[PDB]
Every structure is written in structure tokens, then in C-alpha cells.
Write a protein that binds this ligand. Structure first.
Ligand SMILES: CC(=O)N[C@@H](CCC(=O)O)C(=O)O
Ligand SMILES: CC(=O)N[C@@H](CCC(=O)O)C(=O)O
Ligand SMILES: CC(=O)N[C@@H](CCC(=O)O)C(=O)O
Ligand SMILES: CC(=O)N[C@@H](CCC(=O)O)C(=O)O
Ligand SMILES: NC(=[NH2+])NCCC[C@H](N)C(=O)O
Ligand SMILES: [Cl-]
Ligand SMILES: [Cl-]
Ligand SMILES: [Cl-]
Ligand SMILES: [Cl-]
Ligand SMILES: [Cl-]
Lengths: 288, 289, 291, 289
């Protein structure tokens, strides 16, 4: 699967002092099966604001023979559509309350974002498959409270494995279905975790536009978190917000389930290579 | 860029031998588009029974730069699965009564058949894209009677057009969605006719194992159906089973909308290349007339 | 060879096909397992300056369907323009350029320019081409006192041409020859192409010019067919058979004396090359022994 | 379209260790101008003695998108051929006296060596263009003394530049032509020096089997020659062989024209990549100082 374009060669010659790190991390990521390298979660905003960088970083991985499983959201675009129509979005515990009309908007938005990412990759000569259904099976998280929102109960691996075996990056929406075919909205961070539990990749990467987790009291970027030692302390800290406290609790539960060779990385999309192919990385890594 | 092997070019030359045929091929080969070449409906049984030949035929089309829109069924596999787990299939008027468990089976079988065909194509060097949702929008056909069965109200073309633009054959299931996201079961003959309605392709082909429609009173294959003359009579004949009635009604409604130059060919896969490259039909040809 | 039909190859192949007969003749070439060289094509030098894209396109078609021609080109007209611009009058006898030291310098520069133009035009269409500018033709002086630096070709070294083809590149040859000790000698491209056809015994022998064959000067009509055994002796006595036309006809007659009766030579415009190679054509001038 | 395999990229990464080296490689890898990366002179003996390693090294360069100008000799093969027909090689001052028959032997050997190297390269997937005339224009050096030997007066750059633009390594012999087309023999060290003068490449590399120049008084390889200081003294030393003297003089005269940042490396093929990718000299390095 390794086939370096001119662009790939140029990117590989970044931070040449780390070239032995680069070759070691390439070798490592390549040693496991093609479906156990990485789950990469993409925030919806990246597809609207930073599509070239997102497509380029995924093309880099593709061209060096790596097949990340790509799972994206679409939240900001949904809020845009709702707003144009005069409708305010509504969340509880960071989860969108999704009635029938809202689900219609969520579906349309997911499909548009999905095809945009797929097409941007194909324009770079990267084979990509839109996987928009048939992967996540769910029941209702809480119908009275969230309406059409899912709690994922099983994952069907076949579409992702087939894509990778055919030489195409699988590009998934985080939309789930009940077994009987009612589509149910699921938060992208949550859907990514479920993929990770089933595929057990070496890496789960959460891409954003803000960077890694920053310490409020000291202002410094948090490079690493050994969760066995630090979790109890970090959650006590009064600087961490509710939105950050929610993400970190579901990361803790994921890494408790996964083996210790798995790890999480929260990074700016433009720091993907630096995070993955150097010792010190770029954003926040989280180990158990 | 596009390239064709010696073997590909030899097979192409074996399929075209008149000025009209060459002109037709080149028109769609070099087409910057809007105009679609073909909608091909694939009977579900063909995926279980004759996959290599189906895949090989479609791969040849791809290797000569043609991009048919492919929609397949899965009815026979659903019946087998239901029967395997000790559940009796349930139909009314040739339409599957699809309760919640049945729909789960339908979805699983559709996905399995879809991936089987896509993967057979990839193995032959054909780029193929599964398209499993986001194309058909539907209302309930009759919720009390058929349960989770749809009546298609519109077709979203973008996924199909995006696949073709990227150089991948679009391989579609016939499942549709309500606007609020309830997936609904739709007979594949009906869904394929709705694709042909909105794309108005040069060729409209239905693949079955019988290679057409057989007249029950005579035991002879029907070569031609002139709908304007024969439709009302044909539909009153007691040998015409519900599945066939569903198909012919859809085709009749389709051909009422399309121009009189359009036709529908119900054929076996062995006659596909001849049906697509020439005007010398095979199997059962249906048109307005 | 490498058969790889691009979009343009497919279009070019099928555009003029309208019968099963035409389909069948293309199939004959594509399914053949013959090891005989497909073609020697002589290119009139003027075509490289006047119709380069079309020339390159036609040669590209052959390359893409795996039927590599051996290409030998001239450069006479642009040499004459160069000499004329320097206030020097071209000097010929019997179709052959009298070539003193200064003229040879001009000839060498023009050959190299035309050669690289053709090679580069092919490369720009994705066709690998190899300039072959020495090491093929070995010659003696034809007549030193009469013609000066002009060669009588004594042998053809095939290896350079065969290596090019084996590597997947069209061999693009100039018609200059060398004495054993390395004095380059000018040779008319019609003659040098004939020497290639003699030694390679190709299936097809085509001479490309702009007028599209040979014109009967008395009647003002393109000659469609020349049967040499019957017509040659009378042909050569005609008033309009002189200069370059006489040299051409004599060369082709001598070539065909050596080759089997099944061989023939077509003198055509490049626009008719595909039709004439593969299908039915009344274009240009066909020359054969006849019987 | 450019692609590189894993092993190619691994070998590239093994050759490049500093940021300076990265930027140097990128400058020539991404070039859209007429700048030249390298002129590499190949001793004739290497083509008979170590062809696979030479071809493999040049193929690596090609596979990382670098297009060195390659000029090779053939002296040892000519000597062998002359000796095979009972003729003693005849030199004066390191320059072959070349009568008509000797020229015929030189021409045939040059063509054979040239096609050997080109073909070795093509077998490794490298596009290579033989360039056997139309580059070097020369007068007679001294006709009474050396006979058919040339003094190069100009280099025509177009054939070499057209080759590189087409994605093919230009593989040159050192034969020259008088304006009126007499081929004249020219020592390959001199011809390669004339190429370096007009192309002003980043790297100037002479490949020989000894991997440099050995000091005869000590038996030790000379690592660095600083010409402004050492040239006059060096050329007086009685161990300095005919051929070596000619080479050192050409290089001295070449370096008088080039900027002081330039140098010439006389090395073995095993040190070629190190010499090209890094500024750590190997073998015998020559510069003005
Ligand atoms: C349940 C829920 O909040 N879903 C998300 C899915 C998109 C995303 O995560 O970006 C939403 O915003 O509707
Ligand atoms: C409603 C209905 O009958 N759907 C079909 C769809 C599959 C097919 O057509 O092959 C079914 O068998 O469930
Ligand atoms: C000897 C002779 O007439 N050579 C030809 C070669 C070029 C050509 O044929 O176009 C000439 O014009 O000099
Ligand atoms: C003039 C002269 O000595 N030429 C060299 C050319 C070959 C080489 O340099 O290897 C010779 O040996 O004839
Ligand atoms: N933020 C960090 N400290 N990252 C360390 C990354 C280490 C290594 N590149 C990896 O991906 O596993
Ligand atoms: Cl938002
Ligand atoms: Cl599904
Ligand atoms: Cl069937
Ligand atoms: Cl004509
Ligand atoms: Cl040597």
C-alpha cells in the first residue's frame, strides 16, 4: 500500500532529526493489521473550515500505506441550517435533542459533509468510500429526553473491512440505525469510541481546530496524561470546564476497556504528522 | 488516465460493427454527461447464483469507460434467511409484509448482497462504490397492510453522479428513507424504474434468471410487449403472478413518462453486452408501441 | 510490445470504423503473433515544421496499439531556407545535395533540430521516443569530386533501433551516415529509409510527404498506382521524372527488386496513414513490382 | 506521474540526516528552472567491471526524482580491443593518438559501452537516452601529433536539457564533431569537465575504481587537494601519471571558472550517494581553496 507522491516525500523530510522516530513509528503502525492502526474522529467544523488540511493529512497516511478509519460529525453545519430556518438548536449534557424535523436536517448535513470529505480525498487521488449506514446499530438513549438519539449496541465491521481491503479509506458518518431501520443521531466522539472498542486500534485521534487540552491555571499545554495516576487529581481541578470534563470521562472509560498499547490523541488537524511520527508529539496524548 | 488493455479493446471490437453502434459507444464514452448510458436492475438471485459472470460483464463495461447505474435486489436471500431461522416469508400482492424483525433481515441481506457485488467488482479491478442510503425518499405505502414498505416520492441524484465523476460504478440497494430517517423496504423493480424515470438513460435493463417473461398459457417466452395495445389485457390474465404484475405496471408507468424512443429489456446476463451495444434486443422487450 | 489504448487511442481507432470488415482488419493486427517489424516510415522534413502535431498524433496511435514504427526523417526544406537566408543557393544533382564543409554544418544543425522537435512532440503526447543520430548507417563516399560530403551506405547496424524498441521507445532516426573513421556524410532520407526497409523487411513501408504521393506532371493528376515491372522504364523517361522525384522512384524500384513481390511502398500524406496502414484506401501513390 | 516505493524512501531517509541536506534535496527535486544537480563522469572500466552497482546507484537517484548528467569513457575497452588484434595502444601525455583505424575501434567501443549502460538502466525501470553526437563541437587538438583528437570549442546543451525534461537520464559519450562532421576523439575526463563548465552543476563527480588519487611517494589516498596552494607543486611530482596529470589539469581549469563553493570529487561508486546527498567528501576532493 505504500506509494509516496512528491507531496508525501516532502512531508516525510519534515523534522529530519526525528527521521529514526519517523521510520520507527511507520514500522510500528504498519506491523498491525490495516484495520487496527487508527480511528480518526473529525469535528464537523474541520470539513467546512479546513478541508484542504484534513484531506492532505489523510492522503499522507494513505500514501505511506496506512488506512485510518475516519469518523466525522456535522454539528456546526446542522446549527447553520436550523438557524437559516429560524430554529434554535437544543442540547442536554452535550447531546443534541433531535426531533423529526431536526433529524431530517442532521441527515442532509451528514450526507453533504461525508461526500465533501470523500470528494476532497478523491481529488487528491485517494480512494475513499462513503459509509453512511449499516455500521452502528442502536436503541434509544432516552426517547422522552433526547428523542431520535441512539445508544450504540453493536457495530458491523464488514463495510469498514471491505473498504480497507479494497484499498479505500472508509469515511463514516456517526449516524446509527435501530435494527428495524430508524436512523438515530449519535455524537461523533461517542461513535468513534464504539469503533475503537471493536477494532482496538493502536491510536484514537480526535481532530479539532483548537489544539490539545490546555491547563487553565498555568496556561500551559498538557502533553501527556497517565490516567492511572492523574485521573483522580485532574477531575478535582476546578479550572476544567463541563464540556472538557465530559470528553475526558468517556476517554477514561474507553482506555480502561482497551489494552495499554492503545492511546488517545487530541490535536489540531494541522499537527497530525507531528503528533503521530515524533516522540514529543503535538497535542495531548492520553494513556491508561 | 484511462487506459485499455489489448484484451479489453479486442472484446470492444467484437461488440460493435456498424456506424450507428460505433457512434453510440463514442457518444457515451466521451460524454461529459448529464445523459446517462444505462440503468441496470439486477435480480437478487443473480448475486448468489451467477456472480462471476455478472461481475465480469459489468467489469468489461467499466473497462471501456462506461458507467451503468446498478440497482440490485435481495428477495430470494431474505426468504432463505427467514426460512433458515424458522420464520415463514409473508407477502401480499407480491409485496413483502415487512415488520420490524423482517426489516432487520432485509437490511442485513441488502448490505450483504451489495458488498458481495461491490467486492466481486473490486477483485476484477473495477472501482465500485456501495450506495446504501441517501438516494430514495419515500412515504409509507400502506402502513397497516405492508408495515415498513415505502412509496418512493423522489430520487437524490448526487451520490450516483459523485460516484461516476470519481470513476466508480455506483452499486445501489432499493431501500428508501422517510425524511425523518425511517428506512423503508421497496421492491427493487420499482426502485430501478424510479431511477430510470429521473436519469432517462439510453438503456434500461432488467436482469433475471429466466431471461424475460414467459407466457403461462403457452409456455413460450414473450419477445415483445406493445403496452398501448396489450397492457390492460395482459394484466387481466390469471397466469400473470403478482411479482410480474408489479414489474410490468412500474415499467408501464415509466414508459408513459419517458419518450416513445425509450424501451425496457428484461434479459439474462449472457445477453447484456448485446443489449447495450446494439439495437437488436433479446429476451422480453417492452415499450409503448 | 506495450499495448495501452488511451482515450484518444480508442476514439482514433473507432472514429472511421463503419463495417465488420474494418473491425476484422484491426483484429488481425491486434491478435497477430508475428515478429516481423511492423513498419519503416520515412518522414519528409517539411512535415516536422508544417504539421508536427498531426504527425506526432498518428505515430502515437501506432505506439499505443503496440505497433512500433521505425521512423526516419529528413530535413531538406529547412536546410534550403537556412542556406538561402545566408545568401547561398542550394546545389543539387539528380536529387542529391552537393554538400561541401559549410553546407554539412548547416545540414547537421537542421537534422538535429528536426529530430529533437519530433522526439519532443512525441514525448509531450506521452510517447517515449529515442533520438538516434549516429551509429546506424556506415557509408563510403558516393562520389567525392561530384557530391563532396555525401555517402553511399554500405551497411546498417540494427542494434540501436532494436534496443530502442525493446526498451519501449520509438526510434527516431536522421539519415546521416558515418565512414568507419567517423566522417559524417549526408545521405538523402528517401535512400536511407530504403536501406532500413531492405534490412528490416517490414510489413509496411510508407513514405510521407505533403502533396500526398507522386503527381503526373504532364496530366496534372495524382498517380494512384505504379506497377514497376511494366511501367518503370517508360516512367523514368518522362520529363517530370527528374530531380528528387527521379531519385525517389529509382530508390523504391531498387528496394523492391530486393524485397519479395508481396512488399509495396505507399507515398501518402500523414492524414491518410491510419486508413492506409489498416483499412481500405485509394489515397496517395502505391508502388509495387506488380508482375 | 511520480511515485516512490517504501524501499526507495527508506534509502532516501538513510542518506539525508540534516536540515541543510533536506533543503538541498528539495531545491533540486522540486526545480522548475534550468539548474543542474550533477555531472557524473564514469570511467569506462566501471561499465565492464561493476555495471550492476553503477546502474543501481543511478536508478536510486532517478527514483528520488534527480536527473544527473552522465558522461562515460571507454579507454580500457579500446585498449583490450586493440591488443586483441595485435596493436599496442599509443598515447602521448595521457591522450590517445587516434589514427583512422583506431577511431573506428573507439567509435565501436563507445557505442557498445553506451548501450550497455543505457540498457542496464532501462532494465531497472530507468528511462535513459543515449546521446552519441550533437553535443560537443571541436577543432583538431594537434593533427600532426594526435591525429583524430579534438579540442572542444563548444557544448550544445539542448539534447541534454530535452532528455531531462522528458524524464530520461542523458547518457553521453565523449566524442566530439568538427563543424563539418568529422568525429574526433576526446578524453572523457576533459569532456565531462566541459559539461561541468557550461551546466555549473551542484555536484561534480568523477567515478574511478581506485576511489580517488593515490600519492605515489606515500602510497596513501589523497583526501583533499587545495589547488591555489598545491597545484603547481603537485604537477611537478614525478609520480603524477600522464592520465592523472591530464585529469588534475582539467579539474584545475574547470574550477578557475566555477565559484569557490564548487568542488570535484574523485570517488568510487560505493561513495556516490554520500557524495551527492551530503557535504562530507569521500575519496579525493579537489577545490580551489
Ligand atoms: C447526538 C448529537 O449530538 N449528534 C451530533 C452529531 C454531529 C457531531 O457530533 O458533530 C449533532 O450535532 O447532532
Ligand atoms: C417490498 C418488497 O417486496 N421488497 C423486496 C426488496 C428486495 C427485492 O426486490 O429483491 C423484498 O423482497 O423485501
Ligand atoms: C544527400 C542529400 O540530398 N541529403 C538530404 C538529406 C535531407 C532530406 O532528405 O530531407 C539533404 O537535403 O541534404
Ligand atoms: C583522446 C582520448 O584519449 N580519448 C579517450 C576516450 C575514452 C576515455 O576517456 O575513457 C580514449 O581512451 O581514446
Ligand atoms: N502529546 C504527546 N506527548 N504525544 C506523543 C506522541 C508519541 C508518538 N508519536 C505516538 O503517536 O504514540
Ligand atoms: Cl455550532
Ligand atoms: Cl443499512
Ligand atoms: Cl432473478
Ligand atoms: Cl492524396
Ligand atoms: Cl576506472
Amino acid at each position: 500500500g505504500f506509494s509516496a507522491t512528491r507531496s508525501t516525500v516532502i512531508q516525510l523530510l519534515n523534522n529530519i532529526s526525528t527521521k529514526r522516530e519517523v521510520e520507527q513509528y511507520l514500522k510500528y503502525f504498519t506491523s498491525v493489521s490495516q484495520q487496527q492502526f487508527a480511528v480518526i474522529k473529525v469535528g464537523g467544523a474541520i470539513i467546512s473550515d479546513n478541508l484542504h488540511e484534513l484531506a492532505s493529512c489523510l492522503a499522507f497516511l494513505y500514501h505511506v500505506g496506512l488506512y485510518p478509519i475516519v469518523l466525522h460529525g456535522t454539528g456546526p453545519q446542522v446549527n447553520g441550517r436550523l438557524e437559516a430556518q429560524g430554529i434554535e438548536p437544543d442540547y442536554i449534557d452535550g447531546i443534541r435533542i433531535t426531533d423529526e424535523h431536526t433529524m431530517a436536517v442532521v441527515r442532509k448535513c451528514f450526507l453533504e459533509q461525508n461526500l465533501k470529505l470523500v470528494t476532497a480525498l478523491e481529488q487528491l487521488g485517494v480512494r475513499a468510500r462513503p459509509i453512511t449506514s449499516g455500521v452502528f446499530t442502536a436503541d434509544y438513549l432516552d426517547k422522552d429526553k433526547y428523542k431520535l438519539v441512539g445508544n450504540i449496541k453493536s457495530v458491523t465491521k464488514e463495510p469498514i473491512e471491505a473498504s480497507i481491503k479494497a484499498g479505500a479509506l472508509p469515511i463514516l458518518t456517526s449516524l446509527a440505525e435501530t435494527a428495524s431501520g430508524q436512523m438515530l443521531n449519535v455524537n461523533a466522539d461517542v461513535a468513534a469510541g464504539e469503533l475503537a472498542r471493536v477494532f482496538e486500534p493502536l491510536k484514537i485521534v480526535y481532530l479539532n481546530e483548537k489544539g490539545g487540552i490546555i491547563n487553565g491555571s498555568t496556561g500551559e499545554k498538557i502533553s501527556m496524561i497517565n490516567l492511572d495516576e492523574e485521573y483522580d487529581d485532574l477531575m478535582k481541578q476546578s479550572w476544567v470546564k463541563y464540556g472538557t470534563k465530559l470528553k475526558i470521562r468517556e476517554i477514561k472509560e474507553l482506555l480502561d476497556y482497551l489494552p495499554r498499547s492503545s492511546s488517545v490523541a487530541i490535536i489540531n488537524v494541522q499537527d497530525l504528522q507531528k503528533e503521530l511520527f515524533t516522540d514529543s508529539g503535538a497535542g495531548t496524548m492520553i494513556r491508561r
